[PDB]
Amino acid sequence: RPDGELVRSLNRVSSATACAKLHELGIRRSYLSGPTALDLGNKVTGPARTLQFMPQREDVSTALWAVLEEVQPGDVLVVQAYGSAFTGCLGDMLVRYFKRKGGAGIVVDGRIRDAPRVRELGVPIWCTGTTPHYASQSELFPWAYDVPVAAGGVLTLPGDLVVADDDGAVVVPVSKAQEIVDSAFDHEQWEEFSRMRI
Amino acid sequence: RPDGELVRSLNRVSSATACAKLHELGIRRSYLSGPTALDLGNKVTGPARTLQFMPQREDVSTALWAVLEEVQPGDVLVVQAYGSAFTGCLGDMLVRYFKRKGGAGIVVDGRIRDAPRVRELGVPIWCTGTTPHYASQSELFPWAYDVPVAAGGVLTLPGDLVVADDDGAVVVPVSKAQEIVDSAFDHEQWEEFSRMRI
Amino acid sequence: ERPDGELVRSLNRVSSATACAKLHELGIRRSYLSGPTALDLGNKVTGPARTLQFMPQREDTALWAVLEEVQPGDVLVVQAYGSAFTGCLGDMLVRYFKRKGGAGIVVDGRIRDAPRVRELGVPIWCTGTTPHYASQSELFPWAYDVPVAAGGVLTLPGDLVVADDDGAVVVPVSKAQEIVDSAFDHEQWEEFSRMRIDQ
Amino acid sequence: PWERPDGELVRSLNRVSSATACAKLHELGIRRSYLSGPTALDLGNKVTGPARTLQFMPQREDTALWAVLEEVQPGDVLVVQAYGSAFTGCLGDMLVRYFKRKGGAGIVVDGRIRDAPRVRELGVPIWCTGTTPHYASQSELFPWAYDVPVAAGGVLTLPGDLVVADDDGAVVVPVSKAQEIVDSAFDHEQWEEFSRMR
Amino acid sequence: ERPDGELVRSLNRVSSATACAKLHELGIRRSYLSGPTALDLGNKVTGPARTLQFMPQREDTALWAVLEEVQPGDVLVVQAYGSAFTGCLGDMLVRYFKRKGGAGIVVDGRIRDAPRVRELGVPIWCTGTTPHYASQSELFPWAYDVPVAAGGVLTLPGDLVVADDDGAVVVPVSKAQEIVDSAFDHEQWEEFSRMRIDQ
Amino acid sequence: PWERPDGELVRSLNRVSSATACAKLHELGIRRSYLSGPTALDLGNKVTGPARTLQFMPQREDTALWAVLEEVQPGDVLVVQAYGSAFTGCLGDMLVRYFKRKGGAGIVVDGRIRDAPRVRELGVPIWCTGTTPHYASQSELFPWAYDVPVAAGGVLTLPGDLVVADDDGAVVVPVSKAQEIVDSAFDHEQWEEFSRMR
Lengths: 198, 198, 199, 198, 199, 198
Hints:
Chains D, F: GO terms for molecular function: 4-hydroxy-4-methyl-2-oxoglutarate aldolase activity; metal ion binding; oxaloacetate decarboxylase activity; transferase activity. By secondary structure, chain A is of the alpha/beta class. Chain A is built from 6 helices and 10 strands.
């Protein structure tokens, strides 16, 4: 759906700048507090495939299954798992089907299962840890697959851009995208000048 | 909607029993971890009017406004506020319109504003604290008004019964209600026997 | 340097739940001391800050220095970091504080000798209570009339404190009147809005 | 299998607060003497007596709690190590009746409690970290062994030593140092009770 | 009392992410030690527990007693409560542990002398690292071959530990074989399910 | 406005770990000597030097951070008290360039950091609690005063005293006790380096 010529231009921006400019627009809550980079040296931007977990009513995972077959290639996955230290949102298998489907990145307010195998895969993912547990093993089990999400302290709606970095993830809404792509270029260059004068 | 002859009979049950029996049915997650009683000595059961807060995207409260005018008298309000220590979900005003509308109780995974005035009102409410802040003042602002809710570690769907007590709140789903009303009577009496033999 | 005594008598007629909304109106966004909870309900305090600050220990007293300088109407804004191993005040110091007529105490910490300092009819605001005393486990006392980061807010010595069951709020002497002339506006159109919902 | 202490030292100790006792123990080379966590269930009390210690431990799905109450002699205090779990209400209404019929002095729980509305109307004083509808083995803990060295709070508590507990908190005073407090605190009371006037 | 050496050589071929699912299958629900994180990546450990337990201090050594009883293949399941003020092991004890051939260490606590105990090619699992040493701030050592509540799980002396980057899992000698005869079932129909998704 | 110390004591101290220094300070009557919180940004380092201390404080919406870097002499270490805030990235890419051009030895932050991908490729070693896209005054903190007594970690740090910092953590060694470590640790090294063989 989004303009592919913007996912490119937004990628030239760092989260630390895209967040600092989202501020002056009048939006302080754009940094996902929780998700950290599994491995160093990555940057990712793209539309946000939202995933929402909910607390498990034991017998009251084709909730999150129906997401992976809905990845228009180049998407970023944003998962709401409440920072649970006992649910693995994605395992070694479901990450394969992500990069094979054209996945750009993964951001989780939770943890991720099978760390040794999933590190040696070509997808950068942001999580709060690593568990042996799977999704529907503990107090949580998946729910929806394209709805508003409270990962971090941020409102991540389906479609918005996620400028992932080593500083963390920053949600840029599809409305204020170009407003920043142009506002950050005139910033990181002004900054780039002062870098060479020293 | 629910059978009024069950809200009565469920009220004869304590949360500590209704939760312990919800367990053996095959449901461990029924106790809302967080909400505590504002004042001692209360018990409440009724259908759950669900309220869901979401993180505030500053300029992107008629979300929670549309709940209070939807209280078929006798309801219980269950609020998802993520235990925020900087959002007052309900103030001295909106609690009046609750008991005036026929509100049975309030359960909040957050805090409540204007504690001195709201204590001298005839409604029992469960919260995690008291704030001077209002709802849309901090990182949160309301969202939906009759949807699934993750207050506590529990899945609270619209309609289910909330057997509030001093032990805390326990969500009894409309399916397993009668299964427990009859299972707890044969328990707390068996227990009541052993109370008199000592 | 206590200010207009009519500010207290007028601001004490403002809830803290309103003082935030009318300080948030003024742009002052963080004014609620996240931590201090009322020891017993029904209290209400308004007055200037006599900020007490603690800092971690090292073994290389300043706690009395505040009390010998307490003035009637003062509020004791203590920055104890929430240490559940340091009793900031006890049976003695609470007396010395009320022997002078201290209007109230707001602590980001705990209390020594809870069973006694409750019958002493002085309103307190702390994070708990401990059988420890200050400078026992992890932090000495320190400066006694300086800026203080009490909950997540800057308490500058002189500011006004509004402490009701919601918690305490810091009202600076600079922007103090703009709230009383906006709480009156609020209360009027709350009172009238309260009359109508009844009938 | 310890043995009860000099009963006239317990009565001589209940004149002492937990602050002073914790302060003297600090001066004797024992800074770990305040059980951080347990708060009073109701406002006015004082309890002194030895510690019949109960230790919970994590429940691996492969009745030693009832045996604890069988060994509760009069005048003694119960100490529980429940790791502060908000999903294991240790002692319910019934197991506290047994504690009072045996003449128990008080209860200190590094964990929540079961059947709050009832146990608040019993005469026993309890210090704990909350209240739950869960029971003692429902979730992630279960009773393990009794009368072993217990680490409740942050304090090393071995079965036998005395537990002064006012509204400040609980303090484990060992028997070998129990007299050294009564000598120091007795005259220290004449110190403090004097200067209260000038 | 180390068991069937073929259990190690067969269980070490099972990930911890699978051992949970096949212990959760057996009803054993809490088997993941919530806390211990790998010091450096790429490690893998399987062996019996030599459970070390700490308890809070009082000032009234048992830490070496474990090491003088460490046996080749042992895993050191330490219960340090996550104390960021107690260095459980240092440059010395890590050697003594590997001088005996200790297969790995799983700590619910921290580490003393991180810059050195990383070049020592022994896989560790802790909650952090501290310039403190054990029995300095808040807890003594204690029993050295008893049951241990390491993360939120009961480590009984004898059980098997599977520690890969996900964290450690406690496999009891009782129900150890039922997993290897179910991980083989899993891996086969994961491998075949992995072949197909490619093409 | 302190003054630099005996530079040949700093070089004599960089031979000492932070464990031993913290251990000696413990033996000298100073148990508060490890800044709990700050972790290394990258794995292999050691930094010793005095503390140019910066103190953040809560931001009340009514540039003393740039003035801190102006006073940074060579060989010294920077200490920041940011209360561990995950919404105030204190020093960015630029303000670390200034720190290295001035010849700063190292940075220790009781808080997160700004512009992670860049500052990891600079030669400076930093100890902090995370990484953020937020900047130094965006959210709830803002720079207050510099070169005042700083409480970063759990330690009393007054401007001037030395900060040994390996991969274990940071340790504030006061100047008056700085020599007492080098004497004790020097021979203690001959103690430990000996028994490493038997």
